[PDB]
Amino acid sequence: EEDLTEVKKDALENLRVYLCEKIIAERHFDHLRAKKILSREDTREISCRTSSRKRAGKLLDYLQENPKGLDTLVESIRREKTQNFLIQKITDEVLKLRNIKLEHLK
């Protein structure tokens, strides 16, 4: 996936918005508390779970400049709720983002 994946930091940003509601760790803590990316307090801002956008919004936010930190989430989303459905949309992003590799290279 590597050639199409170098883009992934850009992908993770558009990913932030489409995943944030149907995602993990706002679910209880569960799918996020599985791997425990960072410390207790990091996960505290996500416990804040008021209005829909902030809930997982700050979660994925704090992981962003941690290359595999947000990957840690999508990796776990793989089988997560029902099936690969979300993962397929993420796969679409990474493969489609390949054009952006050329753009960032220009």
Side-chain angles (χ1 to χ4, degrees), residues 4-97:
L4 304 74
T5 304
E6 294 160 59
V7 294
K8 198 168 187 171
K9 285 296 270 51
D10 299 89
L12 294 179
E13 185 52 82
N14 56 272
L15 176 142
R16 184 208 304 245
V17 62
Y18 61 58
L19 270 188
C20 168
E21 30 61 286
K22 300 175 298 301
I23 192 154
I24 68 170
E26 191 289 318
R27 295 306 78 124
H28 307 321
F29 289 91
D30 53 83
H31 297 153
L32 191 280
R33 187 65 60 194
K35 286 183 167 71
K36 301 166 295 304
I37 322 86
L38 310 184
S39 304
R40 184 178 72 196
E41 277 54 279
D42 304 83
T43 59
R44 289 301 309 149
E45 233 299 83
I46 123 178
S47 180
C48 299
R49 68 182 66 237
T50 185
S51 49
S52 311
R53 184 81 297 165
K54 212 302 281 275
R55 312 187 294 171
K58 274 290 103 182
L59 168 73
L60 329 181
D61 178 262
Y62 72 85
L63 317 163
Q64 214 299 270
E65 208 51 64
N66 187 273
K68 198 194 183 311
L70 225 181
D71 175 84
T72 286
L73 311 205
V74 50
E75 184 203 286
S76 308
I77 306 181
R78 202 77 62 163
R79 183 278 167 237
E80 210 225 319
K81 299 182 179 66
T82 313
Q83 54 175 269
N84 64 330
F85 180 79
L86 280 181
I87 320 304
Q88 185 62 211
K89 180 68 204 70
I90 302 173
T91 304
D92 163 72
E93 289 304 322
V94 178
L95 278 56
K96 171 168 53 62
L97 255 293

